[PDB]
Amino acid sequence: YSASPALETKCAKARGAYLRTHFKNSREVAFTINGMSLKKAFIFLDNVKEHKQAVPFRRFNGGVGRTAQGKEFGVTQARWPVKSVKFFYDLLKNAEANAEAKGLDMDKLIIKHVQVNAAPKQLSSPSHIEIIVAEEESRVSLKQGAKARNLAARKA
Amino acid sequence: QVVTRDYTIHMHKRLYGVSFKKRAPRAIKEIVAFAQKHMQTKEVRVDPSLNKEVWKRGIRNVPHRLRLRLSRKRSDLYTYVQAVDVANPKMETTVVE
Amino acid sequence: NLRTQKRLAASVLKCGKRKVWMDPNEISEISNANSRQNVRKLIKDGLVIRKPNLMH
RNA sequence: GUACGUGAAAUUGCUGAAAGGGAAGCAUUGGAAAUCAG
RNA sequence: ACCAUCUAGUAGCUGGUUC
RNA sequence: GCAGAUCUUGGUGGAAGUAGCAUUCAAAUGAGAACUUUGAAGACUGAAGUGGGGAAAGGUUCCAUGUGAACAGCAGUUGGACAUGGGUUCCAAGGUGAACAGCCUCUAGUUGAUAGAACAAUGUAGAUAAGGGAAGUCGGCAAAAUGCCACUGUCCCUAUCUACUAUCUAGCGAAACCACAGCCUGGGGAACGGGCCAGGCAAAAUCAGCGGG
RNA sequence: UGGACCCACUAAUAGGGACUACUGAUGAAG
RNA sequence: AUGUGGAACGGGGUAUUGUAAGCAGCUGCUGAGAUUAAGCCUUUGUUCCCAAGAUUUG
RNA sequence: AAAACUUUCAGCAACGGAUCUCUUGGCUCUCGCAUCGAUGAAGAACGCAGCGAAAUGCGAUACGUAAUGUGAAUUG
């Protein structure tokens, strides 16, 4: 994968390729849900699916409508792409299952790494998606040294 | 929890200025929305006969006030919504035994 | 889906698709029958009801 | 790993670092941080 | 009207022409 | 031996997530239902039909079963799509009425066109307007008055009301164009400019209008 | 200034030049 | 986040319209009846709801 | 005077298919030979395999039969 983590010590992995979702919306959802606790991310995705929270649009923010639900992230522009969230929800189900398989502690899991890459254009622009969940945790010169020696004797 | 309360609705204030072609749909929308705000539940179930008296007078003509009965029946907790007919629809909310 | 069953029932009863009515609690029984004789047997048993002509 | 030898650039994403008050890029001189070399 | 050959045409010019 | 030829072929960008694209309830199926199906209502087409058939043309699209895609510019469990087998111009109800007119129906058929939320600036379409009745405009342009006189929001002077676009949301999603960029004043022989000079100055990210440049 | 050089009103109806900005709306931050 | 709390109805007031069916002999019950907040006022009326969840905060 | 945003740098992953290596191919040159058809040519169509859709092979004897040679396969 992309990052030096995914060591089997305290990690679990999941990925998706050629997922039929827009690249830019998937990127914005990935950026937002990065670093959150795993169970915390789930309800947040449930909130976005049910319009009780919105994912900020930061890089691909062209023409987004301003909403009051983008206030928690400090931005003025927010949107609720539900297709990409459903793709992310399924991916997190699989990553959660892989965590079960390896045998971690699921209560303290965090989204350590998530990255969306462009896929062979087929037109739509598919997106490769990958998720990592894991756990948290001179010298002394002759004159300088001689002065150090004299001051050492001075204190005593 | 399981309770049956007979309610009455003032649709005319709720349908004031609503587009004629959308008078009937928004009505049904409002009843279910009303149901949540009084039953504290999110999902409901509407008697198909109830919709019959909703559409008796067409799509744009809905009676100003209607009498309804809400029952918090246990799910398979849903709210079955039934039409209640009285000579005059102007009485206070009652708790049907 | 009971489009095939509805078409067979309409042909058997010689009535239009509007005149054909089915019991809401007999979907499995109606879908199981696929033969004309089975449709006639279901009609005789009362599974399918032909709606009479209304008004003029 | 059949989207299969090698896998470049344009181009995109993530991490790390740094800079930014109506541009930037470049050159000379040094400072700072990193990193070498005798 | 189109097609293929003659054709790599008439070029007195336009543009480009590599450490 | 390449930086150029509005070079050739292939690949990739910004523009840009931008421009843009009459049903309701309940039940069943199904991972998944606003689009599948069933029951009910709303309706719509309406015997010169969105009915029942044929000719020309098509060729298996017919039928049942099955469904990861692809296709049905949303969706899809459904499909003239995919797979597997199987299979050989004619007719013209009732009422109104002169009428095969229009309108409502009768028998039959459709609920399909991305959808949701609101209603603000603009625009399109449509109405009413006190008092004056061509003063607007080169002008009876367009409506109004019927199917010199008279009428009229053309105007004085606009106001209000309705639908749609419009905006926002879920989905789908371009292209032109592109050396690099984008505050202003004066000066730079010219052409004075967006870069130079001298100043004024200068604090992220954006949303909607006006298009001045 | 209002009407076809005119004919009135009027205090008077003088003579001339010519992506960014603009208008509103949010907004992170010492 | 439990109170002259909030909501849903209902009553009263104010309004718009112009006297509802039926009965009795055009008349009387009938300034009736209907609508009344959707950008009207008020409520000892009846009922319910709330003594929450998530996030960001030196 | 943070974060986001933009830009630059490096690591990693995408995207793309350059580079390198190869090769039952092409191109060029030389040499040799003379052989279509009414006894139905060249070409076309339809068929023929156990399962082939592909290319060749073949003609109802149909991816061939007879004869000779080799000697023990065919192949997903």
Swiss-Prot record, chain A:
One Gene Ontology molecular-function label: structural constituent of ribosome
Coiled coil: none
Pfam families tied to this protein: Ribosomal_L22
Subcellular location per the Swiss-Prot or TrEMBL entry: Cytoplasm
Keyword line: Cytoplasm, Ribonucleoprotein, Ribosomal protein
GO biological process: cytoplasmic translation
Highest taxon, organism lineage: Eukaryota
GO cellular component: cytosol; cytosolic large ribosomal subunit; preribosome
Entry annotated with the keyword Cytoplasm: yes
Record's signal peptide: none
InterPro entries, sorted: Ribosomal_uL22, Ribosomal_uL22_CS, Ribosomal_uL22_euk/arc, Ribosomal_uL22_sf
Any further remark recorded for this protein: There are 2 genes for uL22 in S.pombe.
Quaternary structure and partners: Component of the large ribosomal subunit (LSU). Mature yeast ribosomes consist of a small (40S) and a large (60S) subunit. The 40S small subunit contains 1 molecule of ribosomal RNA (18S rRNA) and at least 33 different proteins. The large 60S subunit contains 3 rRNA molecules (25S, 5.8S and 5S rRNA) and at least 46 different proteins. uL22 is associated with the polypeptide exit tunnel.
Family, similarity comment: Belongs to the universal ribosomal protein uL22 family.
Function: Component of the ribosome, a large ribonucleoprotein complex responsible for the synthesis of proteins in the cell. The small ribosomal subunit (SSU) binds messenger RNAs (mRNAs) and translates the encoded message by selecting cognate aminoacyl-transfer RNA (tRNA) molecules. The large subunit (LSU) contains the ribosomal catalytic site termed the peptidyl transferase center (PTC), which catalyzes the formation of peptide bonds, thereby polymerizing the amino acids delivered by tRNAs into a polypeptide chain.
Protein's name according to its UniProt entry: Large ribosomal subunit protein uL22A
Gene that specifies this protein: rpl1701
Swiss-Prot record, chain B:
Superkingdom to which the source organism belongs: Eukaryota
Subcellular location field: Cytoplasm
Keyword tags: Cytoplasm, Ribonucleoprotein, Ribosomal protein
GO biological process: cytoplasmic translation
Lyase among keywords: no
Pfam families found in the cross-reference section: Ribosomal_L31e (PF01198)
Gene Ontology CC: cytosol; cytosolic large ribosomal subunit; preribosome
Major location category of this protein: cytoplasm
A GO MF term: structural constituent of ribosome
Summary of the function given for this chain in its UniProt record: Component of the ribosome, a large ribonucleoprotein complex responsible for the synthesis of proteins in the cell. The small ribosomal subunit (SSU) binds messenger RNAs (mRNAs) and translates the encoded message by selecting cognate aminoacyl-transfer RNA (tRNA) molecules. The large subunit (LSU) contains the ribosomal catalytic site termed the peptidyl transferase center (PTC), which catalyzes the formation of peptide bonds, thereby polymerizing the amino acids delivered by tRNAs into a polypeptide chain.
Family, similarity comment: Belongs to the eukaryotic ribosomal protein eL31 family.
Subunit structure: Component of the large ribosomal subunit (LSU). Mature yeast ribosomes consist of a small (40S) and a large (60S) subunit. The 40S small subunit contains 1 molecule of ribosomal RNA (18S rRNA) and at least 33 different proteins. The large 60S subunit contains 3 rRNA molecules (25S, 5.8S and 5S rRNA) and at least 46 different proteins.
Protein name: Large ribosomal subunit protein eL31
Swiss-Prot record, chain C:
Complexes and interactors: Component of the large ribosomal subunit (LSU). Mature yeast ribosomes consist of a small (40S) and a large (60S) subunit. The 40S small subunit contains 1 molecule of ribosomal RNA (18S rRNA) and at least 33 different proteins. The large 60S subunit contains 3 rRNA molecules (25S, 5.8S and 5S rRNA) and at least 46 different proteins. eL19 lies in close proximity to the binding site for eukaryotic initiation factor eIF4G.
Official protein name in the record: Large ribosomal subunit protein eL19A
Family: Belongs to the eukaryotic ribosomal protein eL19 family.
Locations listed in the record: Cytoplasm
Phylogenetic lineage: Eukaryota, Fungi, Dikarya, Ascomycota, Taphrinomycotina
Highest taxon in the source lineage: Eukaryota
Known function: Component of the ribosome, a large ribonucleoprotein complex responsible for the synthesis of proteins in the cell. The small ribosomal subunit (SSU) binds messenger RNAs (mRNAs) and translates the encoded message by selecting cognate aminoacyl-transfer RNA (tRNA) molecules. The large subunit (LSU) contains the ribosomal catalytic site termed the peptidyl transferase center (PTC), which catalyzes the formation of peptide bonds, thereby polymerizing the amino acids delivered by tRNAs into a polypeptide chain.
Note from the entry: There are 2 genes for eL19 in S.pombe.
Species whose genome carries this gene: Schizosaccharomyces pombe (strain 972 / ATCC 24843) (Fission yeast)
